[PDB]
Amino acid sequence: NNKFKVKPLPYAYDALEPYIDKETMKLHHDKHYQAYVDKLNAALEKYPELYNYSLCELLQNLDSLPKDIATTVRNNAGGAYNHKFFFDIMTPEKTIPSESLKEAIDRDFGSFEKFKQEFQKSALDVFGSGWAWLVATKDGKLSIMTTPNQDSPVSKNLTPIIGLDVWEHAYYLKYQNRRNEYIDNWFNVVNWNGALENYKNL
Amino acid sequence: NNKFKVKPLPYAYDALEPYIDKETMKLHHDKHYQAYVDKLNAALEKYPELYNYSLCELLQNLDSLPKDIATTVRNNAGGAYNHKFFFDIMTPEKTIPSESLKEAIDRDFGSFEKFKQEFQKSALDVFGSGWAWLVATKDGKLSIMTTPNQDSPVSKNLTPIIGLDVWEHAYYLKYQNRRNEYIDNWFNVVNWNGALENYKNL
Ligand SMILES: [Fe+3]
Ligand SMILES: [Fe+3]
Numbered sequence: 001n002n003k004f005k006v007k008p009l010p011y012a013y014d015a016l017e018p019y020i021d022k023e024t025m026k027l028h029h030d031k032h033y034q035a036y037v038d039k040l041n042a043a044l045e046k047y048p049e050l051y052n053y054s055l056c057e058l059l060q061n062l063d064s065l066p067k068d069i070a071t072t073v074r075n076n077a078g079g080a081y082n083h084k085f086f087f088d089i090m091t092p093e094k095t096i097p098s099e100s101l102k103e104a105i106d107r108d109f110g111s112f113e114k115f116k117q118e119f120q121k122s123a124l125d126v127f128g129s130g131w132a133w134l135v136a137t138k139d140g141k142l143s144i145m146t147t148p149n150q151d152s153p154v155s156k157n158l159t160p161i162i163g164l165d166v167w168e169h170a171y172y173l174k175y176q177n178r179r180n181e182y183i184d185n186w187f188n189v190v191n192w193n194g195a196l197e198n199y200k201n202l
Numbered sequence: 203n204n205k206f207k208v209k210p211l212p213y214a215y216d217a218l219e220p221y222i223d224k225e226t227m228k229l230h231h232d233k234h235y236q237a238y239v240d241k242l243n244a245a246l247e248k249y250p251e252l253y254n255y256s257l258c259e260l261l262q263n264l265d266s267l268p269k270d271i272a273t274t275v276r277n278n279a280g281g282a283y284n285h286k287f288f289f290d291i292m293t294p295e296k297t298i299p300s301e302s303l304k305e306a307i308d309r310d311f312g313s314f315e316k317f318k319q320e321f322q323k324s325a326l327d328v329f330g331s332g333w334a335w336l337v338a339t340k341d342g343k344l345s346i347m348t349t350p351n352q353d354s355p356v357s358k359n360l361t362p363i364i365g366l367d368v369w370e371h372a373y374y375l376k377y378q379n380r381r382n383e384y385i386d387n388w389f390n391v392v393n394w395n396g397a398l399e400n401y402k403n404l
Contacts, residue, residue, distance in 0.1 A: 128351035129330035168370035
């Protein structure tokens with residue numbers, strides 16, 4: 001069996017309280033993330049060799065996949081990848097920026113605080129469903145960008161370092177329309193050690 | 203003062219229970235709808251003569267508005283129009299299809315039940331944020347279409363007859379990920395008399 005799988009949450013469903021509620025963690029992981037994986041798997045039944053691609057490879061080749069599944073793959077491989085990534089980029093442990101990522105953030109944004117303000121503004125300005133990302137080019141240059149729906153920076157050959165889901169399902173139970181508060185609180189659970197790994201894997 | 207305004211909810215905030223919760227009605231009308239109107243008004247300060255356009259006229263002329271506000275108008279005039287329309291198309295009163303709309307639905311979809319099934323499927327399949335619509339061409343031909351975000355059929359010269367908001371803020375508090383249940387329940391509050399008026403105004 002080489003079907004795609006849901007990665008078990010890397011911590012307890014309530015580990016991120018009080019910043020993100022346990023009910024949302026359960027829905028977000030067990031329902032939304034699960035649905036993306038199931039839908040992806042269903043679509044690939046027609047082309048079982050695609051089960052041997054990684055999610056990255058699917059996302060890097062959307063324009064060359066068979067026309068009849070390309071959009072479904074974009075959306076569902078997108079959702080699967082983005083959510084695996086998102087749950088991995090948060091943690092109940094306390095972390096801070098360090099090593100090359102810490103330096104790069106200062107280099108590219110002037111300071112951690114300037115980076116944080118830009119990120120929060122971008123997250124806040126996403127219209128409709130989508131994501132805010134800290135991304136790196138192949139040479140380690142950092143920038144902030146957003147994607148709609150489940151589109152991913154990976155498809156534009158950019159490497160996600162951190163990313164924030166701003167689909168309303170990610171925050172409505174606790175914050176309702178107050179996305180600004182959700183964004184501000186989320187920085188308490190960003191896994192900067194994971195982010196460093198992401199940046200190093202360039 | 204010819205600034206755009208929020209239309210007061212046409213019924214009590216709990217009038218649509220148990221199909222839509224009062225808390226959602228309050229957020230949806232008092233926060234989300236309100237924000238679209240405020241943002242629209244803010245953007246038009248630069249071009250005060252646009253306050254004399256109707257929402258329809260703004261939406262029918264997005265490609266010819268000044269470049270610097272066109273997208274903001276699309277999104278916010280869109281949200282303002284769509285929400286005014288949406289709250290008007292629901293009611294606590296019991297209503298059924300009648301007159302020309304009743305006939306047209308049978309003509310164009312075969313039966314009310316076939317129309318309802320197609321509408322629910324379209325509503326269910328919207329990916330990300332958006333709307334499902336029953337629309338009419340200028341000659342009264344009916345069809346079902348969806349729009350993303352706050353895009354409107356009005357911009358494609360189609361006349362909305364009914365429409366369902368499937369942004370997650372419209373249903374998450376009560377239904378969470380279970381959009382199917384939200385869609386099914388919503389048919390209990392569709393204002394078919396309003397829909398008939400919409401159809402007659404062709
Ligand atoms: Fe999500
Ligand atoms: Fe809405």
